[model samples]
Target chain A: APDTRALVADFVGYKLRQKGYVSGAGPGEGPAADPLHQAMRAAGDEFETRFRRTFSDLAAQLHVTPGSAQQRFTQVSDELFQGGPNWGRLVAFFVFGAALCAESVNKEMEPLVGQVQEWMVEYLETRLADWIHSSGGWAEFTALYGD
Target chain B: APDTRALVADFVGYKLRQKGYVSGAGPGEGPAADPLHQAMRAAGDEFETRFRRTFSDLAAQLHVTPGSAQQRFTQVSDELFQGGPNWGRLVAFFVFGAALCAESVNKEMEPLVGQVQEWMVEYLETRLADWIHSSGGWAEFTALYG
Candidate 1:
């Protein structure tokens, strides 16, 4: 099976191309330099470091009880975003999920890592679906981050 | 679904790893440098060249009459290898199929290209089963060209 990032990128790109969203169609205009999108890109860049943060900071505070780790993960997500869903928030969602998986592995709950990654995927697909549709289905996202 | 080459390499590698066939064994060892395996790599390398040989020689001589293109592909294969199959011949088989599909696209028989490749895959996997088994299921091939 594909990983969470792969699934997320696939759905976004597939929908963009399906909806006739061409990338370089403007009058030589590059991707927008908006700070929101910059944060999205920076967060995406930092995600790899976060996931492998075995000896780094931002340690995930997961519950050891049977299923509370996932619930704890949801709590972490809620803590990050205080505003409505946006493109930046989406990437943040994925990076935070990855951070949880990293902590889960360190906590000896490694078997649950896959399920945790998968949980975020389904959650994002369902929870922010309305925003995705309203924002032209991640076209701006592809224009910025999709190389 | 990936292309013929992608799918083929995936299966061979997957089975090899599952069966615990490690690549490097002997001390200070490299991949086996074999002539038969050399041809496999060369063919894999030439596959890209053949598929893009639009204005060159080796124009795929495909039958224009509808479904005959695929059958003609098989006929061309039969005409190539007269003796028993070898590891080298497997690569040749795939390269020839790709060359045929390239010509099929040129002949405006583009729709049949996918079917032709799929046919080659199924035929190779089915017809060459016994030889593959006797050869220890491509371990040596991987040691050489895997």
Candidate 2:
């Protein structure tokens, strides 16, 4: 059986590649059109748009100013992905994923967290594929993941 | 034994505190001036210095040259302590730590490997303590640690 780390990495890689990742390419797109490459091609455009949307959501939920959330996300996103500066909607993505997983590991709930996790993984994969199919440019993938 | 996560956090916290966690006096020397608080305060300063320096070393080791070690550390460190952006680095750290543990779990070359690992940990702890005693501002810490 695959260990936890490998499983997670596979999940992460799947999510990244499918969601167009930092590059924004579809599955198995490879050196020719890796997803991250696609994302980087248009990183700023999506980053700003998604960041503002997430910032607004946080503002409504947490009672903070939209500007505050936007600024913080920009700082974090920029700092984290400085090389690429993709600065995508990482907070939005991570928080949503975390919430989805909370119920999953709670053994007492008797829910199919495992299946849910698998579903979420597949969902992300689908999303990535969709993004790369529509979007052009997958150079971002080549830069980070390498050939 | 504390869970590995908790133990690591505690150790990290202890080291951070020893290195003058930006919390107590918030930057300058106030509570730190008192000799009674001197030992702890001094440790904090030294730790900061060492922490900054070690980070620089690691960045170089990793071949992250475009950005200075401080930049890389800030990137990786923020990804770690703070969430979201540094998630990848955080994962990488756990992976690295787990790999180290995995290497030792089987007891292969236990004596030598254990001694080396122990020495590194001790060295890290000792250097941290010393840096706490010395660190001043971020720039100073960076220079010394580098």
Candidate 3:
């Protein structure tokens, strides 16, 4: 029922707080001066850069061979989702999920985009539902990205 | 029954693992290249420097007045122990406690050093006993500092 973007923001905020970071009034609240904040920002920046590049390449591959795209997504997803969870990998998943959703909307991936969105929702609910309920992350996410 | 140094090492090792770090096989394993490791080392270095200074200054104050040293130790103990427990602060307490012990040994603080050492052990046993039992931290500590 909630907009998917808001859901993504909530997940990101929750993960940051788990590692002792408090998000500001908005996402662009200027660079954080704290070392932990700086490290998180670096991780997020690196994730976004890698995601955009990989997603684009994957999208292009899908245009050529749909089967190969499926295989590639599965490989990346397995790597990102494997092992006992940690903040770094969780942050990567959230950002990557959001990026994929946006790209799906822009590029029109049809049923494939729908499947990715579904998987993201299922993963979050199963793994982090309690965090979403407890954290002011939803509000923080709205504040950060609603404008 | 466990040594205080081993307890401190276990707590530090737990914090590092929470952040996905692993202690090396030996101390000369080269500097960590991870950004998180870099941040932790910086924090550790800063904590160690300030602690050594404070312990030395406090020891001098103790020489002047035994009561003043006790008051100072209580003040610091309350600050480090009051917060909701977390690995970072816990590690800081352990390292700072170790520093105070080393300084105590140097200054010959008599019954005073004994008090500090007892308090350190009590705090760790009550708050972090599980971690000490589980973490291979004593081995890790030996690898890094032994």
Write down the lDDT of every candidate, Cα atoms only: 0.42, 0.35, 0.45
Candidates ranked by TM-score, best first? Answer: 1, 2, 3
RMSD to the hidden true structure, all candidates: 23.3, 21.0, 24.7
lDDT of 3 at B17: 38
| Candidate 3 chain B weakest ten by summed lDDT | B77-86
Q: On residues A1-147, what C-alpha lDDT tens digit does candidate 2 reach at each position?
A: 112223323333343444433234432244324334333333323443553453344334323653453344334333323433232333233333333333223323223324334444444444444443334323433244333
lDDT of 3 by residue, B1-146 (tens): 53554444433443333333435442213454333333444455555565455445545654577556545644543343233233444445555444443444444543333444455565556545656445444344333332
* Native-to-model Cα distance after best TM-score fit, residue A114 in candidate 3, in Å: 3.6
Best by TM-score: 1
Misplaced by over 4 Å in model 1 are A1-5, A8-43, A46-85, B1-146
Candidate 2 runs further than 4 Å off: A1-26, A29-32, A38-147, B1-99, B131-146
Model 2: interface root-mean-square deviation in Å: 19.7
- Arrange candidates by lDDT, descending: 3, 1, 2
Top lDDT model: 3
Q: What is residue B28's positional error in candidate 3, in angstroms?
A: 14
- Interface RMSD for each predicted structure: 27.8, 19.7, 25.9
